[PDB]
Amino acid sequence: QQRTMSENLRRNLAALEAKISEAKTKKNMLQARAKAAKANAELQQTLGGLGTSS
Amino acid sequence: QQRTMSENLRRNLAALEAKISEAKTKKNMLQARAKAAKANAELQQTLGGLGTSS
Rounded Cα gap, residues B13 and B18, in angstroms: 8
Does B2 sit within 8 Å of A36, measured CB to CB?
yes
Phi, psi of A13 (to 5 degrees): -60, -45
Distance between CA atoms of residues B38 and A15, nearest Å: 81
Of how many residues is chain A composed? Answer: 54
Q: How far, rounded to the nearest angstrom, does the alpha carbon of residue A33 sit from its chain's CA centroid?
A: 9
Q: How was this structure determined?
A: cryo-EM
What's the gap in Å between the CA of B40 and the closest CA on chain A?
27
- Distance (Å) from the C-alpha of residue A28 to the closest C-alpha of chain B? 15
CB contact at 8 A, B1 and A36: no
Q: What is the DSSP letter of B1?
A: -
**AA identity, residue A38:** K
- Cα-Cα-Cα-Cα dihedral of A38, A42, A48, A49, to 10°? 160
On whether the CB atoms of residues B20 and A51 are closer than 8 A, the answer is no
Q: Do A33 and B2 touch (CB under 8 A)?
A: yes
Could you give the CA distance from residue B30 to residue B42 in angstroms, rounded to a whole number?
18
Please report the sign of the dihedral spanned by the C-alpha atoms of residue B25, residue B28, residue B32, residue B34. Answer: positive
**Which whole-number Å values give the CA distances from B44 to A10, B18, B31, B54, in the listed order?**
98, 39, 20, 15
Give the resolution to one decimal, in Å.
7.0
